[PDB]
Assembly symmetry: C2
Homo-oligomer: 330 residues x 2
């Protein structure tokens, strides 16, 4: 199995840790964060969004024992001190959102680590990989990025719609759930004023680089996409609203049939399809990084349409983070 | 097994149906309400609070096929027409809220059923029974009420404390979650002006017969308790705050010990005990109708203390609704 050491036990670090327990190829052997071992166990035991941990966890010797296995608990501010090799960490899940550049992220490899996977879009040119889109483009790089939860939702569906009718151009909107970066009441958000406003009281316009980033994972789409976000008061689960102009004419019945196909075949597990009357909570715990909502989407005509696809911005992304870890290791 | 027929597919009815599945002594055979089998299936398949139905459901000739078994569906306004014997129903779960009296519930019997269990406090003298409080007081009555969620949470804890230190008197407050009777925005509520104001916008003071009802379920407490509610903006899970005066002085440490005793002792399954830093969501899906929160309680002195216990007003209550069906079938 692959030895993984997570850096940052936030929303992502914790959900990837939970999802890893159900896999046979991966082993989490260490956690680093400025969290006491007993606090780390509490944050893992109870989750407001996903329920109590389906497993056992105990504190011992300053470390944790989860489901019978010992996990190294550290509190290193400087990653280049983590001595990952000592527990045998193969790939480090860089989930602090703080070291999204090769220079910073490499401090992990300097620290006895083999490879590192950013759990967020890189700030430098570090390559991002989205499952169902550009995984087969991996070139043995030791540092990569799993992109963002949104790109993980857009790229897959974009690819299918593109390869089938050609996307002339498109504008994406993501009605996204509240995240740890926001405030409970109007607070300071220097780099983004709207972002510091009361999260539960507002619909907050926000900017995302996920539409553009898709032109990076699916080069054929370079320059054909851009968009924005609206942060709304929900704790988890978001949705993309993709407005596209189609090269090849196509009826809505045809667009569905092609998404469903990719869903049942080539894209199985990454892209999903449904014709039920779903709402956001119906996707809390969703592993498919992109679920196409047939009845929600609408077409003005055969070359201009709006498509809707759901995504548990926590669960899906967290699983695909693990798939990329497996991937670059294989 | 015991044959159950649900009347009213609302929150209590739908969660009763669900919990009923993992049982064995009971079997749901029919469901009545004013919805189409396909709408009934949809409501059952997706729950915003408890997740997707863990099983199989589809429609077969205007009926439902859940987990492979056929569930009789009907949409009758008059209970006396349900012809419950055609499906050999033993007990009826009266979950409409419209038939909490003898002459209204009895219609079920007149329809071919054996006994009825109101899933709410009776409007008349019909006997209420709460697990862990007065089940042994059951005397073959054919129509009974399971009281309410709040009563099912308070009665068990009240009994233990009284039985142990003697309650001279107490006042209770339940910080309760929003329910189907409330409004999304300020709306009509002819018999309760506050209960009509936007649920998600306010902390809404409200009346509860709970406390007093404990005086009926636990006759030794008649006139010793009373209380109110504060409806807050959460979708499920409530908590009782009980301020009481004790006869025999007792330290918290001792109150803890006595409750933990009942917990694994006589009250197992009904009364729970935890010393963890829990919040409401951690009990979403809780079966025990009263989980004592050790750390949250406060004592001014050995004869004046405030005790808090959690309860999932949907899940816990519903489970006990089935426990009383089995009980009254002995």
């Amino acid at each position: 199995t692959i030895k993984v050491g997570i850096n940052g036990f936030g929303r992502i670090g914790r959900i990837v840790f939970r999802a890893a327990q159900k896999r046979s190829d991966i082993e989490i052997v260490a956690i680093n964060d400025l969290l006491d071992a007993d606090y780390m166990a509490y944050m893992l035991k109870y989750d407001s969004t996903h329920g109590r941990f389906d497993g056992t966890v105990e504190v011992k010797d300053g470390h944790l024992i989860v489901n019978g296995k010992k996990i190294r608990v550290t509190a290193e501010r400087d990653p280049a001190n983590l001595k990952w090799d000592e527990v045998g960490v193969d790939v480090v899940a860089e989930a602090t959102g703080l070291f999204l550049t090769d220079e910073t992220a490499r401090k992990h490899i300097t620290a006895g680590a083999k490879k590192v996977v950013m759990t967020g879009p890189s700030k430098d040119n570090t390559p991002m990989f989205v499952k169902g889109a550009n995984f087969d483009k991996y070139a043995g790089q030791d540092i990569v990025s799993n992109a963002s939860c949104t790109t993980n939702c857009l790229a897959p569906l974009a690819k299918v719609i593109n390869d089938n009718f050609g996307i002339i151009e498109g504008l994406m909107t993501t009605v996204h759930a509240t995240t740890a970066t926001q405030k409970t009441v109007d607070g300071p958000s220097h780099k983004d004023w709207r972002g510091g406003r009361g999260a539960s009281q507002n619909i907050i316009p926000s900017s995302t680089g996920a539409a553009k980033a898709v032109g990076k994972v699916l080069p054929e789409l370079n320059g054909k996409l851009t968009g924005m976000a609206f942060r709304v008061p929900t704790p988890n689960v978001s949705v993309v609203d993709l407005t596209v102009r189609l090269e090849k004419a196509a009826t809505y019945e045809q667009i569905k049939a092609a998404v469903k196909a990719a869903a049942e075949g080539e894209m199985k597990g990454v892209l999903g399809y449904t014709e039920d009357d779903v709402v956001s909570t119906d996707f809390n715990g969703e592993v498919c990084t992109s679920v196409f909502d047939a009845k929600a989407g609408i077409a003005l005509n055969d070359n201009f349409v709006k498509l809707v696809s759901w995504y548990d911005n926590e669960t899906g992304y967290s699983n695909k983070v693990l798939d990329l870890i497996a991937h670059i290791s294989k």
